[PDB]
Write a protein that binds this ligand. Structure first.
Ligand SMILES: CCCCCCCCCCCCCC(=O)SCCNC(=O)CCNC(=O)[C@H](O)C(C)(C)COP(=O)(O)OP(=O)(O)OC[C@H]1O[C@@H](n2cnc3c(N)ncnc32)[C@H](O)[C@@H]1OP(=O)(O)O
Ligand SMILES: Cc1nn(C)c(C)c1NS(=O)(=O)c1c(Cl)cc(-c2ccnc(N3CCNCC3)c2)cc1Cl
Ligand SMILES: [Cl-]
Ligand SMILES: [Cl-]
Ligand SMILES: [Cl-]
Ligand SMILES: [Mg+2]
Length: 382
């Protein structure tokens, strides 16, 4: 296999075993001041997401042209407020919300973003960016527009003095630093079967299936309650200590913890365990991301909850996640998704998650290190 674009990049070769931790290439000390050229009739436009009209155009581009499953049944449907949460965390920069418009119509047809993140990779901590929401309009696909978007965001990140990035993708590219698998816990099995998310699996009836996936009506962990403002510091402390066991993690300031965890309805939920002493000892979190269901006369949207960061010090992990399922169910979710990273393997089978189709590969740009098992990945991106 060759990669006409990826082969020119500072990433390791697929198939080479890596034994040397460090940058692929030295930092560039002068950077190109001019944007890379797009094809004729298209232009750059940095997108002001504080503008309601412009945020809606981005919502529409992603709603119509972002990630689908291999059979074109489901497409992510990130909401405008969720996009604002994802794309404006602390340290966000306007030039890192990189759009492509058609010159004549103004139509938004491409996007890529970067947000700043401190990343701990093995024994190094490095200021990086996280690249997300790369999207080319379906009518514009396969015209090598994706490499221009990647090069242009790279140049704009370089201008800010940053030379490493982290990203995930569904496809295998040079070269995954780790490979995760999605698993799903049914919460409304009837809808999931009706919309062909899952199959009636041999040999159980529908009635057996609903019974199998039935959950308690309220969580069982004593003192579980939503996170509040007073909890920001101890959620920050617990998260920092907990992550030290993994090899790829974020290093978040207290302000980033407030942004990523403080509850926002229909975007992010976090529940803490406040014990009999008033001490918060654990927390669970999950974010809300629906997917459009296409070509179906009755069901239009599948409501999914996604496991975020789950920190146990005193409640067993297995119990926290069981309460996470119960809460997702009570909130009206159809499915709970989680990856096999961190210590998630310890609960996935027990709590009746089924394996799904498709990997999520983790990558670093301009950094070589050995790859790691999923159990060592402790970074979750939206
Ligand atoms: C210092 C800072 C550095 C900053 C940069 C860090 C790097 C970040 C890299 C990006 C991190 C993104 C993280 C996310 O957001 S992952 C989510 C990706 N987005 C979607 O899946 C939405 C649906 N698909 C699309 O919108 C288009 O198919 C996209 C835009 C994905 C490709 O558009 P198109 O289909 O019109 O293709 P093309 O003709 O323009 O180009 C074909 C070339 O592009 C390579 N390709 C295909 N898919 C991906 C992919 N997901 N990551 C990286 N490369 C990908 C492909 O191998 C080929 O290269 P090569 O095989 O010839 O070599
Ligand atoms: C319900 C549903 N809706 N759609 C849209 C799909 C594909 C499913 N089935 S899934 O649940 O099992 C699932 C899910 Cl959620 C996601 C991915 C995946 C693939 C490629 N890229 C990403 N990114 C997400 C994180 N950062 C940007 C890249 C995710 C694959 C699968 Cl297969
Ligand atoms: Cl190319
Ligand atoms: Cl099911
Ligand atoms: Cl390796
Ligand atoms: Mg293209």
């Amino acid at each position: 296999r060759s990669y006409q674009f990826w082969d020119t990049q500072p990433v390791p070769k697929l198939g080479e075993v890596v034994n040397t931790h460090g940058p692929v290439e030295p930092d560039k000390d002068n950077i190109r001041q001019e944007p890379y050229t797009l094809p004729q009739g298209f232009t750059w436009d940095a997108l002001d997401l504080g503008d309601r009209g412009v945020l809606k155009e981005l919502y529409t581009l992603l709603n119509e042209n972002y990630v689908e499953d291999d059979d074109n049944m489901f497409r992510f449907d990130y909401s405008p407020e969720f996009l604002l949460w994802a794309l404006r965390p602390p340290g966000w920069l306007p030039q890192w919300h990189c759009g492509v418009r058609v010159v004549s119509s103004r139509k938004l047809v491409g996007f890529i973003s970067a947000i700043p993140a401190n990343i701990h990779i093995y024994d190094t901590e490095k200021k990086m960016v996280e690249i997300n929401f790369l999207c080319v309009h379906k009518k514009l696909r396969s015209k090598r527009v994706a490499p221009v978007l990647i090069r242009e965001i790279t140049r704009r990140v370089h201008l800010e003095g940053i030379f490493q990035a982290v990203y995930t993708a569904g496809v295998v590219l040079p070269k995954p630093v780790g490979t995760c698998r999605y698993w799903h816990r049914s919460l409304n099995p009837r809808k999931l079967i009706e919309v062909k998310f899952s199959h009636l699996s041999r040999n159980m009836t529908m009635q057996r299936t609903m019974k199998l996936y039935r959950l308690p009506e309220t969580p069982k962990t004593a003192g579980l309650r939503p996170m509040e403002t007073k909890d920001i510091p101890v959620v920050h402390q617990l998260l920092t200590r907990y992550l030290k066991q993994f090899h790829l993690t974020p290093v978040m300031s207290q302000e980033e913890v407030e942004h990523w965890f403080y509850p926002q309805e229909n975007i992010i939920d976090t529940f803490v365990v406040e014990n009999a002493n008033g001490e918060v000892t654990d927390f669970l979190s999950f974010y809300t991301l629906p997917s459009t269901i296409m070509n179906h006369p009755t069901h239009k949207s599948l409501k999914a909850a996604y496991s975020f960061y789950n920190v146990h010090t005193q409640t067993p992990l297995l119990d926290l996640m069981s309460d996470a399922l119960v809460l997702a169910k009570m909130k009206g979710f159809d499915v709970f998704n989680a990856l096999d990273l961190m210590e998630n393997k310890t609960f996935l089978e027990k709590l009746k998650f089924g394996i799904g189709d498709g990997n999520l590969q983790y990558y670093l740009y301009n950094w070589k290190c050995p790859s790691m098992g999923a159990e060592k990945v402790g970074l979750v991106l939206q």
